Amino acid sequence: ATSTKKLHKEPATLIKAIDGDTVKLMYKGQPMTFRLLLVDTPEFNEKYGPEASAFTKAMVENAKKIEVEFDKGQRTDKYGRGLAYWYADGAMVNEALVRQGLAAVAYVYKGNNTHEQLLRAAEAQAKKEKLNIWSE
Numbered sequence: 001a002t003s004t005k006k007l008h009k010e011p012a013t014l015i016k017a018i019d020g021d022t023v024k025l026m027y028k029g030q031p032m033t034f035r036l037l038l039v040d041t042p043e044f045n046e047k048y049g050p051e052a053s054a055f056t057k058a059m060v061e062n063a064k065k066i067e068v069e070f071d072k073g074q075r076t077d078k079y080g081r082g083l084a085y086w087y088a089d090g091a092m093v094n095e096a097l098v099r100q101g102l103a104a105v106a107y108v109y110k111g112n113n114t115h116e117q118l119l120r121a122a123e124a125q126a127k128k129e130k131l132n133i134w135s136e
């Protein structure tokens with residue numbers, strides 16, 4: 001089975017920050033746009049959008065080391081974007097954004113949701129504290 005298999009972190013280098021949930025990284029020596037697994041962030045024209053983008057930008061740009069961790073299902077979406085959990089010096093970007101109430105758990109599929117419970121826990125706490133998107 002694959003449900004109990006482990007995930008592995010891989011090195012990547014920041015090329016440029018994009019927005020709340022996408023980033024341009026050099027992976028295996030090639031440029032790629034990565035999308036955060038299991039989340040949905042407000043866009044630039046939406047409330048908390050500029051905040052989410054700023055949060056992710058700072059987290060990735062100030063990271064000494066960036067790593068990507070693909071899940072066990074789809075590694076690239078229909079738009080050619082890499083689907084992964086990103087880590088900035090050991091801290092998961094997907095989790096951090098949700099914990100601050102700057103993103104919501106979304107796009108949770110099959111065997112591509114290894115960190116679902118972890119993220120839902122962060123969302124519950126962000127909602128309890130009425131942080132950002134949960135203050136409405």
Ligand SMILES: Cc1cn([C@H]2C[C@H](OP(=O)(O)O)[C@@H](COP(=O)(O)O)O2)c(=O)[nH]c1=O
Nearest residue numbers: 021035036037038039040041077078083107
């Ligand atoms: C996060 C994620 C997004 N996507 C696709 C679905 C959405 O396209 P459709 O709307 O055409 O189906 C789009 C959402 O991305 P954004 O939220 O960046 O716009 O990315 C996946 O296919 N798998 C994923 O795991």
Ligand SMILES: [Ca+2]
Nearest residue numbers: 021040041042
């Ligand atoms: Ca989004």
